[PDB]
Amino acid sequence: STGSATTTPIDSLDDAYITPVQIGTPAQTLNLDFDTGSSDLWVFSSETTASEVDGQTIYTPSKSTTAKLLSGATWSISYGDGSSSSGDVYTDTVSVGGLTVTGQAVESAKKVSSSFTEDSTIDGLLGLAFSTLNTVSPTQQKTFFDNAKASLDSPVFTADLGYHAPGTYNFGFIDTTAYTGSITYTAVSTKQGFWEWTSTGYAVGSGTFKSTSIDGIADTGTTLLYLPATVVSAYWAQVSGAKSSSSVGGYVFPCSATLPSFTFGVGSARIVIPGDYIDFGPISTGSSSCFGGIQSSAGIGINIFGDVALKAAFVVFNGATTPTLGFASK
Ligand code: NA
C-alpha cells in the first residue's frame, strides 16, 4: 500500500503545515501537523476543555462506529516550544492520503496549552518520530508510520514541504518526479527517538563550505533551523544590521535586507536554503525588524533541522531495519 497527502502552510510565513487526516467511521477529517520530532497522534476532541477550543475541528469518538476506548491509557506531552497537551486514548481507523491503519491510537486531548488553543488551523499532531517517544501510559503506542510500515510497498515516508506553497507527504514510495539529481542517504541514530543525523557542514551565501559535523534532528514540526551559535553568528554576520535580541528571543534583521542563502551538507551533497526562506517577517505587525529563520540551538540541547531546512529538500525518512535519512534537491 501507499498513501499521498497534500500538506498546506497554515499561514503566510509557513509557521507550520497541516495535512488532512481521516479518523473514524464515518470519517472525521482533521487537519493535523505532521511532526517528525514527536511520536503522539493527538487531536482536539469532544473531550477537550471547552474554553481551550477556539475554532479547531474536533474528533468525537462517540460518533465513530470503529472507536474504542483504550481503557486506562493516558498521555501527556510537552514540546520544545513550551506547549503541552494531555488526555485519554481511543483506538480507531486512521487514513492519510488513502493509506489506512486500523487500531491506531488516537490520543484525545482533555487539556491543551494556550499556543494550541490560539492556533485555530491545527486540529492536532501526527507524530512521525520513533515510537519509543510515544507518551501513552501504561502501554506505549505505535506511530501511524510504525503501524502502516509492514503494509507499505517500501518502509519509507517522504516530506516535500513547500515554500509559501503546498507540498506532499508520501507513504510507502519515493516519487522520483519530485526531486532533481540523486537522493543522498545518511545515517540515523535512533538513540534519542528522533531522526537524528550528522550534517557534514555549511556555507553562508557564496562563501566557502566549512566541513564540520553538526548532529541534529530532522523535525517537520519545528518551524526554524536551530544550529550551534558559532554557525548562526557566522550566518547573521553577513546581514548588515542583524543582531541577537534577548528581548525578541533571537536574531532579528532589518526588513530591508536581502538575506544570503545557507547551505548544509548531507554527506558529499549540498542542500541550499535560499535567503528568502530565512525571512520570518516583522517581529510585530508593522515593525521594520524582521525575525530570522536561522537561530541558535544553545540552551535547547539539540540542533534542529526544522522546516526552514527541510522545505529546501525532498526528504526521505527510511524506516528500514537500519533507518536512514535521504535528502535531494528539488
Ligand atoms: Na515567533
Side-chain angles (χ1 to χ4, degrees), residues 1-62 64-67 69-109 112-141 143-148 150-190 192-242 244-330:
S1 63
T2 63
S4 182
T6 298
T7 196
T8 299
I10 64 165
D11 64 20
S12 65
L13 295 182
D14 299 345
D15 281 318
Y17 301 78
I18 49 172
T19 309
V21 177
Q22 282 71 49
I23 309 180
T25 305
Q28 301 177 42
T29 299
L30 274 67
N31 298 327
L32 305 187
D33 183 353
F34 282 22
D35 182 11
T36 63
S38 70
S39 303
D40 289 49
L41 192 176
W42 73 263
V43 294
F44 279 79
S45 77
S46 59
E47 302 180 329
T48 309
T49 300
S51 61
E52 295 181 353
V53 182
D54 187 7
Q56 297 79 12
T57 295
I58 64 170
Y59 170 57
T60 303
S62 66
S64 174
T65 57
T66 42
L69 178 74
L70 183 64
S71 183
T74 64
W75 62 280
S76 181
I77 194 161
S78 294
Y79 296 108
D81 64 356
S83 66
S84 63
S85 52
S86 63
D88 63 7
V89 187
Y90 295 81
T91 55
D92 207 343
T93 300
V94 173
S95 298
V96 175
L99 170 64
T100 300
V101 167
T102 60
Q104 176 62 49
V106 177
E107 300 173 33
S108 166
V112 304
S113 64
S114 65
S115 56
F116 291 115
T117 298
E118 287 164 4
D119 186 359
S120 63
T121 64
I122 290 177
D123 303 325
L125 266 66
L126 188 149
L128 293 169
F130 290 91
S131 293
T132 58
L133 298 178
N134 176 268
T135 77
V136 179
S137 179
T139 309
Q140 187 173 62
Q141 303 292 304
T143 71
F144 174 83
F145 178 55
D146 206 350
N147 284 321
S151 305
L152 296 177
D153 291 355
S154 184
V156 301
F157 68 89
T158 66
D160 181 6
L161 299 182
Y163 168 67
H164 295 176
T168 305
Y169 282 102
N170 292 329
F171 292 82
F173 71 105
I174 305 309
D175 181 354
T176 63
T177 74
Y179 61 86
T180 63
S182 55
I183 304 179
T184 301
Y185 291 86
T186 196
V188 164
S189 173
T190 65
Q192 298 190 85
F194 300 122
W195 292 92
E196 187 168 3
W197 65 287
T198 302
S199 172
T200 52
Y202 69 97
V204 176
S206 61
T208 62
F209 184 83
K210 174 75 164 176
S211 290
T212 188
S213 294
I214 303 175
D215 291 350
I217 65 165
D219 182 2
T220 61
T222 290
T223 315
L224 307 188
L225 174 52
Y226 295 86
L227 290 176
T230 49
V231 175
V232 175
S233 181
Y235 176 80
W236 289 106
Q238 296 305 313
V239 178
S240 187
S244 182
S245 171
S246 53
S247 48
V248 174
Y251 280 90
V252 296
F253 69 92
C255 295
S256 60
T258 307
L259 296 180
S261 63
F262 184 87
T263 301
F264 64 94
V266 183
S268 56
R270 307 288 178 250
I271 301 292
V272 178
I273 306 171
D276 282 357
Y277 291 25
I278 298 162
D279 178 8
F280 279 74
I283 61 171
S284 300
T285 307
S287 181
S288 74
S289 184
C290 277
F291 195 69
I294 294 179
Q295 294 295 347
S296 179
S297 61
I300 300 160
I302 202 156
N303 301 303
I304 305 174
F305 292 87
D307 298 334
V308 162
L310 301 182
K311 75 192 179 184
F314 180 84
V315 186
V316 180
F317 295 81
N318 172 23
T321 298
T322 296
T324 66
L325 283 164
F327 291 81
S329 294
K330 65 186 186 191

